[PDB]
From a paper:
To contribute towards understanding the sequence-structure-function relationships of type II bacterial TSs, we determined the structure of the terpentedienyl diphosphate synthase Tpn2 from Kitasatospora sp. CB02891 by X-ray crystallography and made structure-guided mutants to probe its mechanism. TSs employ carbocation chemistry to convert acyclic prenyl diphosphates into diverse terpene skeletons. Canonical bacterial TSs are categorized into type I or type II depending on how they initiate catalysis.
This is only the third structurally determined bacterial type II TS and the first from any organism that produces a clerodane skeleton. As seen in PtmT2 and Rv3377c16,26, Tpn2 adopts the characteristic double α-barrel βγ fold with the active site residing in the interfacial cavity. As is typical for TSs from both eukaryotes and prokaryotes, the active site cavity of Tpn2 is lined with both aromatic (H180, F250, W254, Y329, W384, W483, and Y489) and aliphatic (V116, A117, T177, T181, G244, G287, L291, and G485) residues to form a hydrophobic pocket suitable for binding the long nonpolar tail of the substrate and preventing water or other nucleophiles from prematurely quenching the reaction. At the bottom of the active site pocket lies the catalytically essential Asp-rich motif D294xDD. Docking experiments support that the central Asp, D296, is properly positioned (3.2 Å from C14) for both the protonation of GGPP and the deprotonation of the syn-cleroda-13E-en-4-yl+ intermediate (TPP+). D296 is also suitably positioned (2.8 Å) near H342 for activation. As with PtmT2 and Rv3377c, no bound divalent metal ions can be inferred in the electron density of the crystal structure of Tpn2, leaving the exact binding mechanism of divalent ions in bacterial type II TSs undetermined. Lacking an analogous Asp on the side opposing the DxDD motif, Tpn2 instead has a G485 situated 3.6 Å from C19 of the substrate. Thus, G485D acts as a single-residue switch, exhibiting sole control over the formation of the clerodane TPP or labdane syn-CPP.
Author numbering: 1 to 79, 84 to 138, 150 to 217, 223 to 509
Write the structure that this text describes.
């Protein structure tokens, strides 16, 4: 009974249930509890919020605590039961402990709409827990932007469909604005159960969607939904590198082909086209004999770099990695450097985003292991072999070798199978090129054998929505690719 057979089994089941599998979040559970009215269900969410709370009374991963901790307490302050106020009391006591310290509150992580989620919850939760005192004011927190959209909504003036993702920031939603909103063909308002909730509180497809979302895990609410293209393209683009001779469902091919359009493809329907998924639809298309067009990708190109979204506040480093990979593959296969200009420029740009320590980060996943391994696949096959590129790649690898742990794995903090599979993946590409360092890259991988075959550990949430989450299908495949690399050394 093979992993190969398993991926093939995963691929058949993916084509059966196109329902996206993102891990629950205390923020999304925290907002859903507050908003889905008449208490269709309340206690199931409460139980889940108390078990996942951290000993220090907070919620979330170390350095991404505010948005989830505010989300949960808002939920447990709305409308108590056993240990709820104890939770609410100890959570709030540990929040003023930080807002009253050195530098005050740590800057907002660049998690989706932190800029809005955080001001909104503190106004609402200010009046809730102004007590438990002897104000917060996060550095990246833009109340101005929050209050602006607030009164744009009340005037019945349309809002960017990007904020439709986080309507739960506008708690009492006026009806004349709710009538502007249409949910997707699956019942979701812009990929978020708690935003859909806000819409509803102010219907068949949408109830079925919320039925499933309050049932999958016993009450805990999936952090986001409706993103079958994202989780399809990332799975398929790892099956195509580490599992050739596993047969891909046609029905999955046609599914991508359905969502791909003039302006490209988004993470899912209800999202606009983005450079990441367009620059991965293309690549998988190529690898499978589909007629693919770089002309569409150039539409996500700006001056010096490809953009996740044409309106780019802060740019994304994996988008440029994912796009260059496609451009390298096309030049190597087609035999012409048609985008010679963009390749080099995108290569320059990728290099200038590396930190002094040797790794990259990304807008979309918060572990440098995702971003570094992606930037490294792109750079090894980058056409020029400029000293900037090989010195870049030389520092990247060095970083990779020096951060391995006694367990054999790697991690932005505690080691994990997702981040270990990223390092071992990035090492394999080095070992299989040769030269100085290449044999230390392989030894490093042989050492990962123990980490993987060892315990069934858990997957920390490293991906960035409005809070962090595991995209389970994508992480399911990543770890097995790491193992396939591992079980070649």
């Amino acid at each position: 009974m093979s992993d190969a057979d398993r991926i093939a089994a995963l691929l058949k089941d993916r084509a059966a249930d196109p329902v996206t599998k993102f891990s629950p979040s205390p923020y999304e559970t925290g907002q859903f509890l507050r908003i889905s009215e008449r208490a269709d269900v309340g206690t199931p969410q409460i139980d889940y919020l108390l078990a996942t709370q951290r000993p220090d009374g907070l919620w979330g991963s170390v350095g991404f605590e505010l948005v989830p901790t505010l989300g949960a307490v808002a939920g447990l302050s709305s409308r108590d039961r056993a240990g709820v106020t104890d939770a609410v009391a100890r959570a709030c006591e540990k929040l003023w402990e930080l807002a009253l310290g050195e530098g005050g509150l740590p800057r907002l992580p660049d998690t989706v709409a932190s800029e809005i989620i955080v001001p909104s919850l503190i106004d609402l939760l200010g009046e809730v827990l102004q007590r438990h005192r002897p104000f917060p004011s996060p550095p990246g927190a833009k109340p101005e932007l929050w209050r602006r959209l607030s009164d744009r909504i009340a005037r019945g003036q349309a809002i960017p469909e990007t904020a439709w993702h986080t309507l739960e920031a506008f708690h009492p939603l006026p009806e004349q604005f709710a009538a502007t909103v249409t949910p997707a063909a699956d019942g979701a308002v812009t990929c978020s159960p708690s935003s859909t909730a806000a819409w509803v509180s102010a219907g068949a497809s949408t109830r079925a969607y919320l039925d499933e979302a309050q049932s999958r895990y016993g009450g805990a609410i999936p952090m986001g939904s409706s993103m079958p293209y994202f989780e399809v393209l990332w799975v398929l683009n790892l099956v195509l590198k580490y599992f050739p001779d596993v047969p891909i469902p046609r029905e999955i091919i046609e599914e991508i082909a359905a969502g791909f359009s003039e302006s490209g493809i988004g993470g899912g329907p209800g999202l606009p086209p983005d450079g990441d998924d367009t620059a991965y639809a293309n690549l998988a298309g190529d690898k499978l004999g589909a007629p693919t067009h770089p002309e569409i990708l150039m539409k996500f190109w700006a001056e010096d770099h490809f953009v996740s979204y044409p309106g780019e506040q802060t740019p994304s480093e994996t988008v440029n990695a994912h796009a260059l990979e496609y451009l390298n593959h096309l030049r190597l296969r087609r035999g012409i450097a048609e985008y010679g200009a963009v390749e080099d420029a995108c290569a320059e740009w990728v290099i200038s985003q590396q930190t002094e320590d040797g790794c990259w980060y990304d807008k979309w996943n918060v572990s440098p292991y995702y971003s570094t391994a992606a930037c490294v696949e792109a750079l090894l096959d980058a056409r020029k072999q400029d000293e900037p590129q090989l010195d870049s790649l030389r520092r990247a690898r060095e970083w990779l070798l020096r951060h391995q742990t006694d367990s054999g794995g790697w991690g932005m903090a505690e080691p994990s199978p997702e981040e270990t599979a990223y390092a071992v993946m990035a090492l394999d590409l080095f070992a299989s090129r040769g030269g100085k360092g290449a044999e230390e890259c392989a030894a490093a991988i042989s050492r990962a054998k123990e980490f993987f075959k060892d315990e069934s550990r858990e997957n920390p949430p490293l991906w960035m929505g409005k809070d962090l989450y595991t995209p389970f299908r994508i992480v399911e495949v990543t770890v097995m690719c790491g193992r396939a690399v591992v079980s070649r050394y």
